Tab-separated table of C-alpha atoms in Angstrom:
chain	number	residue	atom	x	y	z
A	2	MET	CA	43.177	-36.604	26.650
A	3	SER	CA	43.614	-38.871	29.788
A	4	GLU	CA	45.824	-42.206	30.324
A	5	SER	CA	42.876	-44.401	31.371
A	6	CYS	CA	39.756	-44.745	29.179
A	7	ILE	CA	36.462	-46.855	30.538
A	8	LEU	CA	34.592	-48.654	27.439
A	9	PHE	CA	30.511	-48.474	29.866
A	10	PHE	CA	27.795	-51.233	27.645
A	11	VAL	CA	24.952	-50.476	27.063
A	12	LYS	CA	21.414	-51.379	25.307
A	13	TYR	CA	18.695	-48.572	24.663
A	14	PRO	CA	16.380	-49.515	27.580
A	15	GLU	CA	13.429	-49.895	25.122
A	16	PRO	CA	10.529	-51.786	27.233
A	17	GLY	CA	11.000	-55.816	26.101
A	18	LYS	CA	14.049	-55.194	24.777
A	19	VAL	CA	15.697	-54.881	28.070
A	20	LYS	CA	15.933	-57.019	30.888
A	21	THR	CA	12.454	-59.602	29.874
A	22	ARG	CA	13.633	-62.620	32.063
A	23	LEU	CA	13.452	-60.233	34.536
A	24	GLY	CA	10.682	-58.648	32.725
A	25	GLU	CA	8.744	-61.849	32.257
A	26	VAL	CA	8.112	-61.826	36.511
A	27	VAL	CA	8.069	-57.105	37.025
A	28	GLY	CA	6.886	-56.746	33.761
A	29	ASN	CA	8.328	-55.339	30.755
A	30	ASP	CA	7.839	-52.013	31.728
A	31	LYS	CA	9.374	-52.322	35.211
A	32	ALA	CA	12.601	-54.032	33.554
A	33	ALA	CA	13.258	-51.587	31.404
A	34	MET	CA	12.508	-48.580	33.792
A	35	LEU	CA	15.369	-50.388	36.480
A	36	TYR	CA	17.553	-50.821	33.740
A	37	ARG	CA	17.382	-47.483	32.656
A	38	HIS	CA	18.918	-46.527	36.494
A	39	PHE	CA	21.327	-48.939	36.525
A	40	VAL	CA	22.150	-46.979	34.026
A	41	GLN	CA	22.346	-43.211	35.443
A	42	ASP	CA	23.528	-44.771	38.091
A	43	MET	CA	26.199	-46.015	37.134
A	44	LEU	CA	27.417	-42.803	34.923
A	45	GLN	CA	27.590	-41.218	37.972
A	46	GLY	CA	30.336	-43.002	39.811
A	47	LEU	CA	32.092	-43.851	36.709
A	48	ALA	CA	31.546	-39.988	34.763
A	49	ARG	CA	34.023	-38.787	38.270
A	50	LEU	CA	37.015	-40.865	37.942
A	51	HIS	CA	40.059	-40.058	36.459
A	52	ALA	CA	40.588	-41.330	33.660
A	53	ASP	CA	37.732	-40.518	30.035
A	54	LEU	CA	34.728	-42.482	29.593
A	55	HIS	CA	33.116	-44.158	26.236
A	56	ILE	CA	29.578	-45.386	25.986
A	57	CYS	CA	29.720	-47.805	24.131
A	58	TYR	CA	25.392	-48.724	22.861
A	59	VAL	CA	24.158	-51.829	21.196
A	60	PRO	CA	23.941	-51.706	17.575
A	61	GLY	CA	20.321	-50.718	16.652
A	62	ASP	CA	17.644	-48.255	14.452
A	63	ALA	CA	19.241	-45.057	13.163
A	64	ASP	CA	17.512	-42.704	15.567
A	65	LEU	CA	19.815	-44.071	18.595
A	66	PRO	CA	22.542	-40.427	18.339
A	67	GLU	CA	20.326	-38.592	19.735
A	68	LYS	CA	17.744	-40.900	21.566
A	69	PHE	CA	21.552	-40.873	23.828
A	70	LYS	CA	22.819	-37.811	24.076
A	71	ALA	CA	18.346	-37.147	24.905
A	72	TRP	CA	18.057	-39.582	28.241
A	73	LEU	CA	22.417	-39.746	29.277
A	74	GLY	CA	23.400	-35.906	27.642
A	75	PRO	CA	25.088	-33.905	25.144
A	76	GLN	CA	28.233	-33.988	26.311
A	77	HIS	CA	28.606	-37.844	26.946
A	78	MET	CA	30.828	-39.562	24.005
A	79	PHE	CA	28.803	-42.400	22.547
A	80	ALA	CA	29.944	-44.535	20.062
A	81	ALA	CA	27.758	-47.660	18.513
A	82	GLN	CA	28.881	-51.250	19.437
A	83	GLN	CA	30.173	-52.701	16.270
A	84	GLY	CA	30.516	-56.882	15.247
A	85	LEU	CA	29.224	-60.040	14.470
A	86	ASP	CA	29.196	-60.944	18.178
A	87	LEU	CA	29.872	-59.807	22.176
A	88	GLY	CA	34.329	-60.577	21.700
A	89	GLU	CA	34.302	-58.700	18.357
A	90	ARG	CA	31.567	-55.647	20.150
A	91	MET	CA	35.192	-56.252	22.696
A	92	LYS	CA	37.397	-55.879	20.776
A	93	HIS	CA	36.530	-53.083	17.938
A	94	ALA	CA	36.138	-51.366	20.913
A	95	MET	CA	39.373	-51.471	23.099
A	96	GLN	CA	41.182	-51.678	19.873
A	97	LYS	CA	39.608	-47.750	18.887
A	98	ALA	CA	40.808	-46.522	22.635
A	99	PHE	CA	44.024	-48.136	21.955
A	100	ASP	CA	44.367	-46.539	18.666
A	101	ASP	CA	42.854	-43.020	19.894
A	102	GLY	CA	45.864	-43.408	22.088
A	103	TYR	CA	45.665	-44.363	25.502
A	104	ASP	CA	47.096	-46.236	27.536
A	105	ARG	CA	44.909	-48.328	30.269
A	106	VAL	CA	41.722	-49.764	29.122
A	107	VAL	CA	38.627	-51.143	31.084
A	108	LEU	CA	35.153	-52.469	30.088
A	109	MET	CA	32.387	-53.318	31.701
A	110	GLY	CA	29.039	-54.118	31.162
A	111	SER	CA	25.561	-52.207	33.060
A	112	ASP	CA	24.215	-55.343	34.995
A	113	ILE	CA	26.915	-53.913	37.928
A	114	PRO	CA	24.148	-51.428	39.322
A	115	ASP	CA	26.500	-51.036	43.014
A	116	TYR	CA	30.040	-52.012	42.266
A	117	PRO	CA	31.912	-50.141	44.242
A	118	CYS	CA	33.175	-47.294	41.391
A	119	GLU	CA	36.590	-46.981	44.053
A	120	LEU	CA	37.313	-50.464	42.421
A	121	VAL	CA	37.155	-49.340	38.393
A	122	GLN	CA	40.161	-46.928	39.508
A	123	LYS	CA	41.760	-49.854	41.193
A	124	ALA	CA	41.887	-51.414	38.315
A	125	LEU	CA	42.316	-48.764	36.774
A	126	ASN	CA	45.811	-47.575	38.381
A	127	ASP	CA	46.874	-52.128	38.805
A	128	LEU	CA	46.977	-51.771	35.315
A	129	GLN	CA	49.554	-49.739	35.217
A	130	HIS	CA	51.280	-52.890	36.434
A	131	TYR	CA	49.683	-55.424	35.126
A	132	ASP	CA	49.177	-56.995	31.722
A	133	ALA	CA	45.603	-57.661	31.637
A	134	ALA	CA	42.578	-57.097	35.299
A	135	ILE	CA	39.391	-59.290	34.729
A	136	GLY	CA	36.124	-59.112	37.030
A	137	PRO	CA	34.892	-62.479	37.502
A	138	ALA	CA	30.472	-62.948	37.681
A	139	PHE	CA	28.456	-65.243	39.300
A	140	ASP	CA	26.798	-66.584	36.422
A	141	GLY	CA	30.625	-67.829	34.498
A	142	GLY	CA	31.803	-65.210	32.613
A	143	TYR	CA	33.043	-61.393	33.417
A	144	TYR	CA	31.835	-58.146	34.183
A	145	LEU	CA	35.480	-56.540	33.100
A	146	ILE	CA	37.995	-56.698	30.781
A	147	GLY	CA	41.177	-54.561	31.037
A	148	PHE	CA	44.826	-54.169	29.624
A	149	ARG	CA	47.393	-52.071	29.269
A	150	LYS	CA	48.500	-51.068	24.960
A	151	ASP	CA	52.204	-52.108	25.346
A	152	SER	CA	50.139	-55.851	26.019
A	153	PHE	CA	46.339	-55.803	24.129
A	154	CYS	CA	46.017	-59.574	23.587
A	155	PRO	CA	42.654	-59.452	21.453
A	156	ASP	CA	43.051	-63.399	21.067
A	157	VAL	CA	41.761	-63.258	24.632
A	158	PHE	CA	38.445	-62.872	22.812
A	159	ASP	CA	38.580	-65.369	19.646
A	160	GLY	CA	36.505	-68.355	19.910
A	161	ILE	CA	35.122	-68.300	22.862
A	162	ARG	CA	31.301	-69.896	23.561
A	163	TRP	CA	29.234	-66.795	23.592
A	164	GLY	CA	25.921	-67.470	25.074
A	165	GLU	CA	26.947	-70.570	25.074
A	166	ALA	CA	29.166	-71.553	27.586
A	167	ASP	CA	30.861	-69.991	30.791
A	168	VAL	CA	34.229	-67.528	29.780
A	169	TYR	CA	35.540	-66.292	31.782
A	170	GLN	CA	37.607	-69.924	32.808
A	171	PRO	CA	38.568	-70.412	28.991
A	172	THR	CA	39.484	-66.792	29.117
A	173	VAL	CA	41.862	-67.083	31.968
A	174	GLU	CA	43.217	-69.650	30.105
A	175	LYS	CA	43.489	-67.483	27.031
A	176	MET	CA	46.157	-64.940	28.940
A	177	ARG	CA	47.506	-67.186	31.094
A	178	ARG	CA	48.532	-69.193	28.099
A	179	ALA	CA	49.738	-65.704	26.144
A	180	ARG	CA	51.930	-65.069	29.762
A	181	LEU	CA	50.049	-62.193	31.203
A	182	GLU	CA	50.468	-61.134	34.241
A	183	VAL	CA	46.207	-60.667	34.770
A	184	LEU	CA	44.919	-58.745	37.824
A	185	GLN	CA	41.535	-60.322	39.334
A	186	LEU	CA	39.275	-58.641	41.252
A	187	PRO	CA	36.295	-59.396	43.224
A	188	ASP	CA	33.928	-61.488	42.104
A	189	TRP	CA	29.816	-59.511	40.993
A	190	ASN	CA	26.313	-60.528	40.539
A	191	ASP	CA	25.290	-59.398	37.528
A	192	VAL	CA	21.055	-58.541	38.367
A	193	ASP	CA	18.960	-60.614	35.292
A	194	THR	CA	16.803	-61.700	37.256
A	195	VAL	CA	14.370	-61.077	40.079
A	196	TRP	CA	16.022	-63.373	42.182
A	197	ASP	CA	19.177	-60.724	41.877
A	198	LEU	CA	17.335	-58.272	42.135
A	199	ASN	CA	15.553	-59.028	45.914
A	200	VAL	CA	19.448	-59.952	46.010
A	201	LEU	CA	20.869	-57.010	45.259
A	202	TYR	CA	17.366	-55.507	47.075
A	203	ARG	CA	18.544	-56.965	50.873
A	204	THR	CA	22.338	-56.740	51.063
A	205	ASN	CA	22.704	-53.472	50.301
A	206	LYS	CA	20.168	-51.593	52.778
A	207	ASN	CA	23.148	-49.420	54.632
A	208	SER	CA	25.863	-49.362	51.876
A	209	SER	CA	25.294	-45.544	49.615
A	210	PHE	CA	24.006	-47.868	46.879
A	211	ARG	CA	21.317	-47.183	49.809
A	212	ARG	CA	21.063	-43.495	47.824
A	213	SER	CA	21.042	-44.275	44.570
A	214	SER	CA	18.279	-43.932	41.912
A	215	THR	CA	17.884	-47.516	41.305
A	216	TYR	CA	17.681	-48.779	45.033
A	217	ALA	CA	14.708	-45.933	45.361
A	218	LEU	CA	12.573	-47.496	41.739
A	219	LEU	CA	13.334	-50.698	44.738
A	220	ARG	CA	11.915	-49.376	46.997
A	221	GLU	CA	9.047	-47.958	45.166
A	222	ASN	CA	8.662	-51.881	44.414
A	223	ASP	CA	8.424	-52.957	48.339
A	224	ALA	CA	5.760	-55.881	48.262
A	225	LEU	CA	6.578	-57.006	44.772
A	226	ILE	CA	10.303	-57.972	45.719
A	227	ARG	CA	10.007	-59.006	48.567
A	228	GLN	CA	7.390	-62.173	46.867
A	229	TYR	CA	10.449	-63.855	45.722
A	230	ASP	CA	13.115	-63.792	48.630
A	231	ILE	CA	15.277	-66.715	47.952
A	232	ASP	CA	18.047	-67.646	51.821
């Protein structure tokens, strides 16, 4: 096993169970197909890094394990997320990875399909020299969190008001109070709404995300997406 591990948080892309806010505009089937492709594209990028990858899925029906294998492939490592809320789920996944013997672990979400893989590698590299890493999202939370084993502070997941506030500042505050040296990664936008999708589409003309399966889908949906232009 690698010294590094990437924990990749996903949900099975069933219509009506994912990206419902985007679905209100483009339809639940299309919102789920887009998200399906977000995940596929990110996996292709992550599966190539200098780190083991654990795909951690939102818990659900008993048929999920084989559904995941049939979708993303039987060769990947899949595990159900476990815990009462997102903070417990993250704490448990990271704690498990460290128990498994990893030195450096990053946990990230699956709503940032254009995120450059090299920044994930950079984060892992930088964790050799920092206690923690965090990537701020435009929406007030974070799209990535990482720790080196000897610095792991599970308490940063405790007492956060999941879904009731902006969690990034309280988190960075708990890290400061823990006397951690923290690497801050670039701000990035999670793609939640049709407006976010429009920006994703219009700002990645001429970047390497243009060759992705996600972007191919967006191009097919040009006439639809361009009806939601934001300045």
